[model samples]
Target: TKQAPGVSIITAEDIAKRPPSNDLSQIIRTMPGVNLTGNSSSGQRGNNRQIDIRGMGPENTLILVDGKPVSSRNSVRYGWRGERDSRGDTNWVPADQVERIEVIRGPAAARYGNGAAGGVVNIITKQAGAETHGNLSVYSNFPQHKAEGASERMSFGLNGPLTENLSYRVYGNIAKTDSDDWDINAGHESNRTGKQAGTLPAGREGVRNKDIDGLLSWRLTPEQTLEFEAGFSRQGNIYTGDTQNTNSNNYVKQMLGHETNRMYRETYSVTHRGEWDFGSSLAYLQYEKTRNSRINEGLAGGTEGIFDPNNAGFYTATLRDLTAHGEVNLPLHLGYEQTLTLGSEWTEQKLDDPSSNTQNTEEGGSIPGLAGKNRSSSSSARIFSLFAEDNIELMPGTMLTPGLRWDHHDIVGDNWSPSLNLSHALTERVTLKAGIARAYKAPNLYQLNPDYLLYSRGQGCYGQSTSCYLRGNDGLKAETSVNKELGIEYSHDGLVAGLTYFRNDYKNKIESGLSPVDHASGGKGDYANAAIYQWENVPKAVVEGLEGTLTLPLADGLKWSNNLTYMLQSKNKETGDVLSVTPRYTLNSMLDWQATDDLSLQATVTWYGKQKPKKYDYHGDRVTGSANDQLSPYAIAGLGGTYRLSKNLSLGAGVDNLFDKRLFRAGNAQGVVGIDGAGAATYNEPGRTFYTSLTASF
Candidate 1:
């Protein structure tokens, strides 16, 4: 199979061979150059998880479905509670509906625009085929240690031709999980902190998710087709944890809350393929709409007085987009096989955040002077873009691809991106590739609106004795990056291997900083008199790394696949300090053995190297902290098997964290260690989970 340089593809067959889980994060956690933070594997809320590529934050990566960008839905925390926050969510698509996934590890700004500076993950959904087919599956997780942690899932999908020229496909899934369990390491502080001793934390985290999707297609003519799609998803989670009291030292407080996230999307598209007198052409037009809402409710009668009625919060966001793209093979006399691609896109987004008023209020809204204020009552942004690309065959075995894109935003002005990629076949089984590109990203709507500010009543200023405030900067600049990569790949029979080296230099990085002038003197006396802090363009960063992947057939019934990434250098240009929260090395490998015609088994391992933590002063610059703040290296193992019970039925089972290894990420330890201890230092991972599933197809 031939693929674009620097691209990795995972097919449905690969997914079916893995453990059963609704979380795609777990499925791709081991990919090279990919990093995961927060809690996505322990049945935690999807919003709490963050994904990074090439050491770049989630905000720099673009996610798409069927070549269309997904809407951005995020929750913004305010006040002192918002520090060290990460944004991004992924729960709208169900794993069962995915046909294939493509990961582009190099810059793709010329093709996909903003958010592609880091990379792009494109998910292609299943389509109706000429043959009628349907499948139903159910799975359950039974832990070895009784009810410490358990889960269940069910899904169904159907696709076929309804008529000669009409076809339809539909899929739905439901999943539920009990609170996750933990196994503490005796030498770790989790065993000594709080009052739990050898026992796990008091609170549990549970989640429930439901999703449905449908697609319809009509063949209008021999060379034209129209398609329509709709999807809906609802995810809810209850998170309970213990927190150490700062006002009264040593006293642990129980914190509990429930949050629900709902998403709805609809799309319509038309595609045409034909040959004109001048050249061959392919054209596509699509329109999409998306709506998302989140509702949060705090449990009553907690130690922190969160039981108050005013603690509830609600938020919603809506997006609309239209795009048209086409490619034509021009009949140029001097050219040897030349093609041109042109595309244009326009998008509008609207946000409604009425809950900020209630959540940011002081004293549970009891104090007249501390009532909550609206930060982003209603905000919107519009974007327009145009792009063009040319593919030329310079010689018998050499090719060149050059592309350019122009984007304009109502709020962020305009940006230009360009790229050139070259590839040559050295032999029948080997190829060499190289590329360089410029990428750009505009600030999000929330970051552009000055009204999104956090105001504290009595926080003293560092330099002065007045209060302090934090707000967004409407004048913030867009970020841009120069990316370069070179690689070579070889394939023969059932064996494949590739190695790539990449470098990225980013400029005008957006970071939080204090303003020169104090807003306290603006008006409203001392209550509003405070130092102003805002998001600003500062700091530069450079990241360079080596990534490689291999797949080989070891024997008649066995095969192996592996991927590894090593960071040669990652640092901030101004401070010359190592970039925080990035692992220096990562490795993932898997082996599969077919014991019989109907039975297959798999074993997998993943490793992450030590990572440094980021500490910051009031200026948002990196500062040195205690050596203990770093995350320790960790490795985990998994095992799974599948057996065909009949021609139309199959059974599968798997075990995750097979040895119950206790793992933790830097800065997440406190919540896992009884929630009452202040210095727990890291986020605890789940231990030893088991699952089984039965599937039937026709």
Candidate 2:
């Protein structure tokens, strides 16, 4: 809460002046200890990046909407390089409907249970109030380059009291972002490969979203309340002819501007909150289901992940998640001021995916129960957890919070997380804070089912000559992280400053095995030396970083805010390669000026330091060569203004990337290309754009 050192909040007022994007992550990234990056440094699907917190990667960053977990990304197939054709779970709630966003980083996030090793993002939506109100908003953006895509969205929300003791809230959103041209990255790939450009890597794909959600609240008594919520959403991607391994063909080329994949999600929940003279309690039960439907793709050799040559039709995968949680808080006075909290949670997950499990890997000899097609690809898992936390005031200006959590998974066994945090005030304007905690993330369904399979030709085998394949293993351990942070803050008249240093010791990291296993079955034809491997746990990795922020008021109506993040180290112990690619340093600065009651102006600039590629690949082989390819440093600037025309109407206009700076993807891996020995040109940066938005409330 107030004593935590690694926490930030983004109010709805802060988001209004920024240019509109379908995803909330675009605005969230401006906070300290946050950035956007792929699941792994290989950058196979670079355009489809998510929020990476403190360099722990996207998987460890837990996303929650109104305190409920959002996990639609789990239905997609996990690839050989840990890549997925997904845009993450940050776009479900419309920008206008978000009341506020709470971002908790480092050790303070461990209390939320599994999958929160890196951090947590809680998006809170607007709630029903005493007065009935309605809001409507629209946004449109146009890019400077013809090849680049454009974005548009419209949304509406209404909330009011339905009866004497009941209230209701409802909202809907519809949005579309056009796909980039298919040949946007053609020249860059040709420069890297030293060959004629025919079929080349594509740019970012577009997405269409349709969402509706509603909530009802009833007051049973003066001190008790009950709430019911339900929501449904549909998301489809506009194809740009992109593949995982830069592979393309006639079928993929023909799919341009078509929807290659679609997702449908339904969720229902009931919650009750009670406030008595002695204590407070909260209880809830939730159920969610999602369906992923897409055209079939190749599963073997260079054709892997590409549209099937013979034109296989569509298929679908279904996933269901159920959760029950309860918590209570009580005030106590054993010796000093103290409050104790106790909570427990139970969750069950099931997945049915035939598209990946039916790959038919008979060329390398089949094992019992995992051989042919049309087999059942169903898997289920359950987890139970208990936790307790206490906030105590030790002295006049000193506070200490201690917490402990225990989780038991039906398949992954048991784990424990312990945390301690302290905050002390030295002077009237100076304070010190520190914390350390243990966090864990269980194995996903795709990594636990033995039927799941992903194959690779000689290229991905890591210094091996024969082909290889990866299978899911039941004997896998949960990943753990020991996160620590220390910081000091100083506050004076109209000025505030703070700095923090964080380090995380990551252990038992799950990954595809590097060495071949000694299996009994041999192979035939070109697969004589095929290597068989399963998902294995690695020993160690580490991430260290520093973050600082400052706020100052320049004049009566002028203010300035700035934040910076720097990475000291991020590497694996065994291979000496980075866990994920990120900028060495990032700096964000913004200034605001309000000259009149109806006019507000703002300006912003972000500077990014160089990003270096790994010297070796995952399999302990040299890849970067002598050239040392790295992304150069760059800066982006923007200016915007918001004007209120009347009591219930406002207009916002802005120019983003004022300098029109842009970059293109060269290739996936470093040193593989013939032209460039080694470099980290793995993602595309869009150029300048003009955006306008209008909002009406009554």
Candidate 3:
């Protein structure tokens, strides 16, 4: 196979001109060994979506903003919204403000620390140049509902030098969106009711958000410069309804009615960059804070005399985080590039319900149920890491790169991650490359301290007088894996092609399972013993696959780009079944035509392959069935164009999901159990959507 001159990098201009999609997940879906779970909607701000690299879960992937360590909304002690398939509602950045995104597939922990067991995603924000530029756009699912059920966004950026030695830039974004309708089927014998439940209602969910980012640079001397940056964002939305099956025996009305939820985030950072005789290096420090709160009411019926408002209390939780990071580099004596880096980080988080302290009762003197209890939990930790990499020139047109890192975690102890790569030029139009690495992932919060109650119904012994049962085990260990990759690329004039293969061998995978129970505890039926779910490092898995891409110049005014990715994903050694929520194959292509010097036209097609869900053995093999099965294979074609109205002013528009495929998973439907019951099918992705935007520069 031949290789391309630059096979590992893609620019922002290329991203914007391709097609419209939401987030980094959609844009990079065609990359090998990658998959996303849950639906695509404003509601999926936080949790709903999970990024799996080589069959590993979201926690095993390292996500970064710039080059710093940005915390995952879901951490060691906090269950990320991904668990319940809920949209955690906590995105701090907007797409319109992005400059570029860098993806490194395979063991990247050596460079990213924890959570890099699978790979890394680095989102680089736009930096203002010596010019000013901005854009504004409005989009809709039903353009006919323009002002009512639509979405609007605006952003601006400015960059220039205040002096010969100083430079600065600022960027900001504001957006608002209305909810979309979703389909649901809930039944009686559902997980909500051990016997028979019924179909539920389909409802609309919406969102509103705002974000801002700014950066300043100052050159103290010809050899040094000081830089600072800060970013903030806020978002809120409505609840995604629960699922219910109508055939179940015991029927309990949905606990909480639809309610309003919101989240807020803030980050500040500073760095000192310098160039000395020893070499060029950067040293920086940063701090970040995030808070999330949700409120739900009207649980124990309407607020009538018999309907105690106490039973319908609202619950709220808050998390606070702070971190500091810094790194340094030094060059080697030879032409080769040798670099060493080091950094330290820390975080503090807390979850508390303000409603917990209230001295209130739902039914006269009785206390409120789960939603009413006042709870408080907090944890803090620190980490220190060191790494080194050497890029050696094996020959004039070839290179061999190797890197390794050691990390010390306050809670999990220590870990070592490493990576290696080799690349060579066969000719001016061809290149070849291959690599392998090892990475590690820390444990999640829920896997350590999860809390919930289980209700039994067979013996008619409704031990209702006391509703308390199971909890999560806090003694879980870290999950680790060895990852490998090999690939080749080729390029000539306007054409390019590439292919890469990858695999992961995992161990100490934290998994949930049913354990032997004490039947004497009011054992009513087969599951009357009430199985407890704990995180055990017992599961093992192997994931392997390949991906390819091609770009061609169709004509002087036209061009084409196509990408195909497939993964033979699997989890759990016993059954050797495909991992749940992983698509088997994906294909994406784009066509662009420059209509004129000031105008351009484009079209795109994207497809998602069918997949089976994960199986769990809780009640029996029956309940252990797949979760979130894949929708049938589907594709969407769209049209878009960009018009340069002036040197600095431009306009862009596009219609996505053009065919309006009804295929997609609703947000946060993970816990839905039992096929014969009633409950929500989860929130579906929005139907055919459209968007338009205008940009100007000075």
Candidate 4:
């Protein structure tokens, strides 16, 4: 809604001026309350960061394409600390094909249902037009430091009329970003111990993407339409010797400059829309499948995440999802202007992952029902949901919105979500708004499969046990959150300013068991001397923050805009440790100047404050030494411009990281004596770079 405080929209014009080289996530981070973060604090796959909204973490940020959910990331193996060996689902579509992106945060996102505790990012793509037309685009980015990655992309889109009442559109994209050199971070490996100083921590990994989609629309009448769509995509990771602990396992190092894993996704859908005399209706049915194939890797402690020395072939994990959904809106007048909306959705999910839970056991000897012989590689779940919402004009200057949702899952049972929002105009130049709602996320298949088991020898065990193991639980509960936000805005004479505060009270958060279960009590398996654990739900966690925005018109065709986000608190009550690593304060500023009718220039900068490390160790114990390290404040800036060469063509160029600032990954633990992980040296920031793009349309 226009008055929603937690909403941000990135229009096509915004993207045309500053485009991303690879994924839209690269640019989405510039929005308020948005950041790129790993799924966990372990920092094992640090460079593989995803969209994190308001410090709630990536798992809580739901992604959608054209209002449809995308779940390809779920096919990746879920790690001990909930980390995933995937780059997230934000890059499925090329940046050039997107028309706009909507970011919804806090209580306003509750209406989207599961996995939206943090918020939602809905990507709207270019749709079909009546006239026949096509466009071609090319993009390239070259880093000053060869050790860092470079990227190149090419995309093509075509839309036209098939008949008097029929139209179709097709698009395809291919891109590649080279991997960072294996030793780019070899100089930043500082540990309290001299031994770690000489060891080589890895750099960022690379990615290759290929995508294609087709859509056909038939106008049944002036007010009715039917559409069919299909799409396919592939993502392959270029390895750079990034093992969980950077151990010099020859097998792992040998994977440098190679594709260690690949994801293939295919989707099909049919949709219908009608503008009836009484109301409007929308309905759709979709089916999607993903195949995650990768080289075999070790699953036990010390060897965890390392490539198997004897295995040179690939293993595949598959995920299938089917969904049916419908919604309707009707206008009403009962002493007030109002609109009522109702919707229903049903989804079925199936997963087959033989490569993830097959770790053989020795010390923590395997449990009878969970051994290799007793386990199945397949698991499934079904969910049905219903929701309703109303937008009412209570008075001349006040609007009220209320919503409710009900969901039933075969694995996690039932959940109820309720929301309320208000907007009021206090004066001709000022407005106030606020909202509160309930949000939730269901357990992934990996966490609900009783046969899923992960074992660790000594290095990864808890409670000082040399031999310990973790088992999946089918009795886990759905994670829930109560989100609240309040804000006010002022606008006049082309100037806009706003400030908002948001908080989330989280419950039933899931984590790998921190306390080991006594074998003599109710534990399974014959190894009574070993410690055992299960996936357990934590009691509470909280995230509170403030967001501010200011836009000013300096002169004719010249403007400046800025936004700041401050995290007041983000912690797990049970352990008194941070829920995740994030900057205490972040500031983003941009200036746009229209040099001429066909030329535009832009300048941008982002400031990040101190980033503190997690207080507890990965195993949930107090940590000391280099693990207490922190990264001081830093800033990154960019300059770019776009020029229209002709009526049907345009050229754009820019310089990224204008200051050439650079940082590299070292490690993930505060307990590693000599290794200075510094909270999250977990990612690599490339040095100064040059980017250029060319497009032609007819």
- lDDT of each candidate versus the true structure: 0.60, 0.82, 0.53, 0.83
Q: Per-residue alpha-carbon lDDT of model 4 for 629-663, expressed as tens digits?
A: 77788999999999999989999999988999888
The CA lDDT at 91 in model 2 is 88
Q: Model 1 has how many clashing residue pairs? A: 8
lDDT score at residue 392, model 3, on the 0-100 scale: 70
Q: Estimate each model's TM-score.
A: 0.83, 0.96, 0.80, 0.96
What are the per-residue Cα lDDT tens digits for candidate 3 across 566-673? 876556674443334556777778898998999999898877776544343223232222233334667878788888899867778888768766433322222333
Model 1 lDDT per residue over 225-276, tens place: 6667666666565433322111111211232334334455555666555565
Candidate 4: residue pairs that collide: 191-674, 191-675, 192-674, 193-674, 627-670
Q: What C-alpha lDDT does candidate 3 achieve relative to the native structure?
A: 0.53
Model 3 poorest 10 in a row by lDDT: 298-307
User: In model 2, what are the clashing residue pairs, if there are any?
Assistant: 629-678, 629-679
Could you tell me the TM-score of candidate 2? 0.96
Off by over 4 Å in 1: 1-5, 38-47, 72-89, 108-110, 144-149, 181-205, 242-257, 260-334, 357-376, 456-466, 514-518, 522-528, 575-580, 615-627, 664-681
- Tens digit of lDDT per residue, candidate 2, span 1-698? 11125888888888798855788988888888887888777767777888988999898999998999988888888777777777888988889888889989988898987899989999999888888988898989889997888899899999999787898999999999898888787667624434413556668889999999999999889889999999999999999877876666778877899999999989899999899988999989889898989888877755667888675778888889898899999899888898899999999888888787877656655554566567677988898999999989888778899999999999989999999888889987888989899998898887887888766655566557567777888889999999999998887776778889999999988877888774325557776446777888889999999888888889989979887788888887767788888899889888999979999999999999898877765355776443357888999999999999998999999988999989877656544323343256777788998899998988
Q: Please report the TM-score between candidate 3 and the true structure.
A: 0.80
